[PDB]
Enzyme design. Sequence first.
Site, short mmCIF file in Angstrom:
data_model
loop_
_atom_site.label_atom_id
_atom_site.label_comp_id
_atom_site.label_asym_id
_atom_site.label_seq_id
_atom_site.Cartn_x
_atom_site.Cartn_y
_atom_site.Cartn_z
N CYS C 163 58.89 22.69 100.90
CA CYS C 163 59.49 21.87 99.85
C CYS C 163 60.02 22.68 98.68
CB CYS C 163 58.49 20.84 99.30
SG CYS C 163 57.65 19.89 100.56
N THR C 270 44.14 23.11 101.03
CA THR C 270 42.95 22.29 100.87
C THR C 270 42.10 22.75 99.70
OG1 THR C 270 41.83 23.70 102.49
CG2 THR C 270 42.90 21.70 103.30
N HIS C 303 58.05 18.26 90.09
CA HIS C 303 57.84 18.08 91.52
C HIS C 303 57.36 16.65 91.75
CE1 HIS C 303 57.78 19.52 95.54
NE2 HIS C 303 56.46 19.55 95.68
N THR C 307 51.00 12.81 94.74
CA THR C 307 49.75 13.26 95.35
C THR C 307 48.65 13.29 94.30
OG1 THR C 307 50.63 14.54 97.20
CG2 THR C 307 48.58 15.29 96.20
N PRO C 308 47.44 12.81 94.62
CA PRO C 308 46.36 12.84 93.62
C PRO C 308 46.08 14.23 93.06
CG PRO C 308 45.75 11.45 95.48
CD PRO C 308 47.04 12.12 95.86
N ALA C 309 46.04 15.25 93.91
CA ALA C 309 45.74 16.60 93.44
C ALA C 309 46.97 17.31 92.90
CB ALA C 309 45.11 17.42 94.57
N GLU C 314 50.21 19.97 88.47
CA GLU C 314 51.49 20.20 87.81
C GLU C 314 51.41 19.85 86.33
OE1 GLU C 314 54.74 18.19 89.66
OE2 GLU C 314 56.23 19.38 88.59
N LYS C 335 61.25 11.55 92.54
CA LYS C 335 60.69 11.16 93.83
C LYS C 335 60.07 9.78 93.80
CE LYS C 335 59.65 15.89 95.41
NZ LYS C 335 60.10 16.59 94.17
N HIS C 340 60.06 12.05 98.75
CA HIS C 340 60.05 13.51 98.85
C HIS C 340 61.04 13.93 99.93
CE1 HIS C 340 59.07 17.56 98.50
NE2 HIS C 340 57.75 17.53 98.58
N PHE C 400 51.60 23.80 95.46
CA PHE C 400 50.19 23.51 95.24
C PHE C 400 49.36 23.98 96.42
CE2 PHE C 400 52.57 20.16 92.97
CZ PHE C 400 52.28 20.57 91.68
#
EC number: 2.3.1.179
Lengths: 77, 77, 412, 412
Positions: C163, C270, C303, C307-309, C314, C335, C340, C400
């Site tokens: 990405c 992860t 970005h 996403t939760p994480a 960011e 997005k 995405h 990430f």
Amino acid sequence: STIEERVKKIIGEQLGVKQEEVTNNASFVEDLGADSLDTVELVMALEEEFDTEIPDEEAEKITTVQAAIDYINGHQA
Amino acid sequence: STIEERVKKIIGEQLGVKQEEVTNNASFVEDLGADSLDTVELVMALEEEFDTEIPDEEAEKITTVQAAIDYINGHQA
Amino acid sequence: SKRRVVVTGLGMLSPVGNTVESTWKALLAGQSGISLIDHFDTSAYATKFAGLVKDFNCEDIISRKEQRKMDAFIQYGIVAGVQAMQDSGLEITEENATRIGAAIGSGIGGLGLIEENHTSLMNGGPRKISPFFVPSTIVNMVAGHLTIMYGLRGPSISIATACTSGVHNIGHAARIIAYGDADVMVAGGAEKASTPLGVGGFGAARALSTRNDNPQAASRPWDKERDGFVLGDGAGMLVLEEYEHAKKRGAKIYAELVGFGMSSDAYHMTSPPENGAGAALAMANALRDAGIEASQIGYVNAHGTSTPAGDKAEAQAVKTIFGEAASRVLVSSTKSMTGHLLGAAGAVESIYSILALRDQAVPPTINLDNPDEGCDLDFVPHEARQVSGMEYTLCNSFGFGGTNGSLIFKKI
Amino acid sequence: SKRRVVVTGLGMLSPVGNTVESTWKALLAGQSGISLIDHFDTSAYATKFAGLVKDFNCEDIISRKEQRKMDAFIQYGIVAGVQAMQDSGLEITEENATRIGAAIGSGIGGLGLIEENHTSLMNGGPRKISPFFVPSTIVNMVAGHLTIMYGLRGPSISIATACTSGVHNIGHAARIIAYGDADVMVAGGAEKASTPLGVGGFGAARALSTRNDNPQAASRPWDKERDGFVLGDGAGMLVLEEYEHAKKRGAKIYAELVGFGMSSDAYHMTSPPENGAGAALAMANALRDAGIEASQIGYVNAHGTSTPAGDKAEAQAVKTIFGEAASRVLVSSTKSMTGHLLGAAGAVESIYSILALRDQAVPPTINLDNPDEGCDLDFVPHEARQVSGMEYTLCNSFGFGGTNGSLIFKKI
């Protein structure tokens, strides 16, 4: 639903030409603008439509529309 | 060829640990170094070995070796 | 006498529009391009929706004969690339051909025709593989076809960094121009991953949102209710040009590309991203590459994958770079409306960042009903925000858990 | 004060050796690494042979747990990347980590695990797709894993330009160092396309040699009996370093990278390449980038894929660039022994070009029994050639219907 017209339909659709341009004496690479991989996918399209295995040494001998029509006619295996 | 030992074998092989380390109270992420996608492929490996569909909301409740053993035992569907 | 790189052409296909202007106008209205998938059976799939290109018609640009030799993502890239070239008004001659190249990539590639050719293989053997399989699937064929139909003989690369592809391809097209290997480059990305293997792939990694009951509200960056990102198709293309070469031929000029930064995270994916030190390092290198302070940045096209994480990481990187002016700079994730676009996300978001310099307006982050408790930042939620004095924009593509890229654009 | 880029580390897996030195010694002996395939049934395949990595053992570098999350081509890249890092003796600290990145690509990617995951999909639906599918297949994961296990936080890109990937990735790693975005870069490519879809794919395009009865004699560049190229697996990795940074830490120095050239062909691939004007333009740009004359080139590691059309086009490009000194410069195709490593071919051949500078020896073009009537060039056939005064080598990766890249290396 003839074999001659079914062959002309696959050719014209594969090479992107109106079926009036797909005459019998027309050559794939000279009259219809086909490159090498065009002819290879054209033979495969012929095989797919009529359920026949065409050997590679014999497919290289299929360079014109009349050459195509004459093969599929005298086989049907 | 027990179910308890077959489950321990899949776990140890999935997470790359000797089966002595795969004790019953061992946690996948804390005691055996598994990340999230490790646990997801571990449940899939369990499904693949025993031919059972484990729902996602119920797979998230499988976080230790004992938690694994207890599920596959009381099912076999 | 270091040469300056400037943007002179735009082209785009997106889930909210098939041109640059229709897409831009759709985003300023907060319109969502996410809908239910119907080109394959999504019964067994946890995600059934994506950002699709609607009413795609390339028949006047790509014949039906050549469309069969192209995966959908290549068709998207050519159409967007043709739009950018036509918009630039560039006249390719025999003399300037060796000075014009391309830098166009993709994160996934021709996933649709890979599936089809492998299905042909598993059913009928290798004799059923199409002779066009390889040229119809690999990621560099968008640059391939475009350099052929316009007669481009200059440097052509294709960066596939997932990405970050869009930002990386444009940034290095500018590096190639600054180095002197080219005067004009057509740069961007293209993606069409909304396929059984694509939706299944990211769904297997549990990274996709599951809000099938409301696809338009699934992509909610920095919102407490987010549950993963939403796939989006499309392509973005820019005509990057040396500044003297552009003004001499009398060229349309959108904005100047003044900064490019890169970094690596050096953790898997992860692992907890936490501070976003990689994201902040990418933005920092781009600020130094431009020679400006973070306080001069007016808009940050984040970005923001919902996403939760990823969103939390960011946000910490934005706080680290901006610091005092963090609660004042405008940040937004387009997005939320388009989804995405993966390898093309950096390409389309670079155009959004350029258009924000032209129209002095910022597109919103829709579906942001209630943000984290950990943030104060202005995410320009629900509705677009009019702006004045905006001079620099920042376009971010993060991993990430991988590569990072940042582009800074300056007005005029 | 433009910074110079120098090579300080090497790593490689190849069909003729699992280290740099064993591979290099095998090539100087004219040994062929081509053999019959036995890891899948090749009954229905027109090509049954390829250049395989034999006795591959990465168990001490990559655990069996992580090997399942990696396609074979990623495993090859990591092992070759570890060799290059260990060879450079580089010590990665907390302070120099943000100045060390990667530029590693691939032309095809994780074709083996794409096939497996799609087979799982067609048999059991999307629930059978592995959650590691995407991270185990995309081309940028070699750079991904390497930046993680060494703690690299610098710029990392991944160029996928088919068989120009190796040259493009190394060339732009040097551009990134010259620009000042990094002091050290690990650059190269990795390929493992000897799969049902890979062998079937190129076989569908009728591009593969059919000499099953004698696989070691199938790859015969510039020979009247050639009938297509031979696939080859492996990986090549180089540690590219800024010259002052290298000498200060007391670094092993193989050669200096002094030139990088790029070009596009702007014809399809079925069109006749004829003059190789794209290939000659790539070599010309690299000569100007280095500032030397073609007569200073001693050895040219050609593309030489053993293709009837490609070899003739490359020969005309060599004649165009060298002209008077053409019949005197040494040219060779190492693919006669290793096969075509595609995205890694430029990487392994860059090391061969560097080692020719170190050992003053040139590997041969085996199986060249009777060349074209159209050529006089010295292809260093059958046996390696000892040499003296060799100061510059040229590594070419061509497309003959696409992108082109050329690297020039200088001794000391």
